[PDB]
Design a protein around this ligand. Sequence first.
Ligand code: HEM
Length: 153
Amino acid sequence: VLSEGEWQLVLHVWAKVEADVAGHGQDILIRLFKSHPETLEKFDRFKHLKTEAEMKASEDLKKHGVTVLTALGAILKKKGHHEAELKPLAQSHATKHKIPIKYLEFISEAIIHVLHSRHPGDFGADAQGAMNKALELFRKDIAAKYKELGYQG
Ligand code: HEM
């Protein structure tokens, strides 16, 4: 359970993300795909992209970055009371898109890296720990729905 102080740190940096959702979404998906190439293979939409330059030029990848960060932002602004928003996301990522929990750990590392790079004055170590905790809470609760459905592994 995050404290109110930890939520404030998370949502303070998140409001900075919201000034450039698309740019962040690009940088986070590119870092995920470069750091963990197995993740790119899960997207038939993107698996043609073979260089970072082709990634950065793809408008469809930039669109999907916005989709991902808009969904994450709506879950973070619920401060933990996010059951309605996670149900459908866990259901599609377990049963349709076939994404292991560990790749949600990987995209959480890429989100934390990109926020540190873009917002270092609002993303010191207090806020990095709080955002770590918020992304762990997201993973914990998606993993419980995976397990329900027979996909925790
Ligand atoms: C912060 C974590 C994530 C969030 C909030 C998120 C959110 C979303 C949303 C909102 C959609 C479209 C609606 C849906 O299908 O449920 C989607 C689609 C999808 N996601 Fe995620 N996602 C996340 C992580 C990942 C990861 C780590 C992968 C792959 C490694 C992944 C793979 C996919 C795929 C393959 C689609 C379908 C894309 C398409 O072909 O249009 N997701 N995601």
